[PDB]
Structures are given as structure tokens and as C-alpha cells.
Design a protein around this ligand. Structure first.
Ligand SMILES: O=C1Cc2cc(Nc3cc(Cl)ncc3Cl)ccc2N1
Ligand SMILES: O=C1Cc2cc(Nc3cc(Cl)ncc3Cl)ccc2N1
Ligand SMILES: [Cl-]
Ligand SMILES: [Cl-]
Lengths: 4, 122, 122, 4
């Protein structure tokens, strides 16, 4: 999971 | 402020390809000369300008069989259908001309672009 | 010896979400309490262990309406349906409990994992 | 396009  | 799962789109496509290999929820047969290819209309639309136009048509959206132009090569179509469901293109010296012609007809602009680049190099 | 188009899976998912927003080729309504959500069975199956089981069932595969357990929160479902079609999860302090519970019921293991991690941190 |  990432910060888009 | 959403978070994003990097592998989600790839995992979705992988599962759609698994459904295709097992003939699950396929709703159309694409006829290319004597050859028949089962697929999901939504995946075909998502990948191809031609299928997008066909299945948004109020009459054609309800057809279970679509016959392609007799000039279309079944192998070129097969390579492109595999690319739709995997992101992987089996581009070879012996098939590049049939793949580019089929991608132009199917309106798959990124495939047409790499075929033109690979032909130019040789 | 295939070549690969990096953005293909993301572009496919983006087009499937565009079809969903325009209600094109949607083939099921998911009922969550008073709320109704239109979707594509194949996308639901590709994202959820629960929908995968439902639509591979020889009887349920043909249903146009699926009613979820009355304990399921419509907002939690909406957030998860958006994630299925975009890879983006709107996880907030006020919804995390309903999102985790809905993801556990829908069998969306990667969402359950990030919810457990985010809860543990607080 | 890449070599996967
Ligand atoms: O080279 C290409 C690939 C492609 C895909 C689609 N399919 C869609 C496009 C839009 Cl805007 N919304 C929904 C869909 Cl399914 C149309 C044209 C082309 N051209
Ligand atoms: O967390 C999850 C997400 C998920 C998705 C699917 N869907 C498939 C799985 C296979 Cl192997 N082939 C095809 C499909 Cl559509 C099943 C279980 C789970 N669990
Ligand atoms: Cl393309
Ligand atoms: Cl997930």
C-alpha cells in the first residue's frame, strides 16, 4: 500500500 | 486522501485471465475465419476501440457471436487476445505484420505503436 | 520471449470503472440494506473470495440480484466497491471498523491486512 | 514497454  | 494497493490492477487482470482459461462468465464468441475465441465483452471493450464501439451499440451489445473481417489472421487475434488478458505481447519477426494489422483493426493504439517501432528498427 | 506494457492492467481497470460509472454491461445489483449497487460480476469475482464463490455456483451464477447479510454497512460496501474498480481505498478513522468487517465478509484479504495494520498503529 |  502507498500514498498515490 | 485514499491509500493505494500497487498490485491490485495486475491481480484483477490475472483473475480475469483465470476466468477466461476456465471459460467462466464468458459472454461472447469472436469468430476469426474458421477459429473461435471465447471472451468477456467488458475486457474486450476495455482493451479495444473496435470492441468498445461494437458493445456500446444498442443492437450489437446483445449479440453472443461477433464475426471479424475475413482479412483478420486468427494467430494475430490470438496473440492480441492473450495481451488483453495479461499485458504480455508475443511479438516475433514471423508475426509482427499480422499483429500490427490486427491491432490497427481492433484499435489498440499502444500495440500499433510498439509494432511500428520494432519494424522501424529492422 | 513476450514484451510487456507496464500500464496495461491499470488502463484496463480504469476503463472497467468508466463502464461502471456509465452503467454499461453491468449484469448484477448488490443489495445492502436499502441501498443498491450495480456492478460487473467478473470484476466482483476478481476482487472478492465471496463473489468468486457466489458466481461460480451453477445456480447463483444466473442471479441478477444478490442480497448481502443485513449486518453489512452500505458505506463500507461502497468504499470497497470503489476500491475494486480503482485500487484506491478511502480508509478513515470513522469508517475503518465498517470497512474491515465488510472486507472480512467479502474475503478481500489485502484490505483486511491494511485495516488490521492501521487499527494496530492507533 | 519492458522485458518482464
Ligand atoms: O487503443 C485503444 C484502447 C481503447 C479502449 C477503449 N475502451 C473504453 C474507453 C473509454 Cl473512454 N471508456 C470505457 C472503455 Cl471500455 C476505447 C478506445 C480504445 N482505444
Ligand atoms: O482476497 C481475495 C481476493 C480473491 C479473488 C478471487 N477470485 C479468483 C481467484 C481465482 Cl484463483 N481465479 C479466479 C478468480 Cl476470479 C478468489 C479469492 C479471493 N480472495
Ligand atoms: Cl493497446
Ligand atoms: Cl484485497
Amino acid at each position: 500500500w502507498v500514498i498515490p | 486522501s485514499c491509500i493505494q494497493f500497487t498490485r491490485h490492477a495486475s491481480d484483477v487482470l490475472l483473475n480475469l485471465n483465470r476466468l477466461r482459461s476456465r471459460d467462466i462468465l464468458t459472454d461472447v464468441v469472436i469468430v476469426v475465419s474458421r477459429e473461435q475465441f471465447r471472451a468477456h465483452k467488458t475486457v474486450l471493450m476495455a482493451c479495444s476501440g473496435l470492441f468498445y464501439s461494437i458493445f456500446t451499440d444498442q443492437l450489437k451489445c446483445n449479440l453472443s457471436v461477433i464475426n471479424l473481417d475475413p482479412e483478420i489472421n486468427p494467430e494475430g487475434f490470438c496473440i492480441l487476445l492473450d495481451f488483453m488478458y495479461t499485458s504480455r505481447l508475443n511479438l516475433r519477426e514471423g508475426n509482427i505484420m499480422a499483429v500490427m494489422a490486427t491491432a490497427m483493426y481492433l484499435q489498440m493504439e499502444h500495440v500499433v505503436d510498439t509494432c511500428r517501432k520494432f519494424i522501424k528498427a529492422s
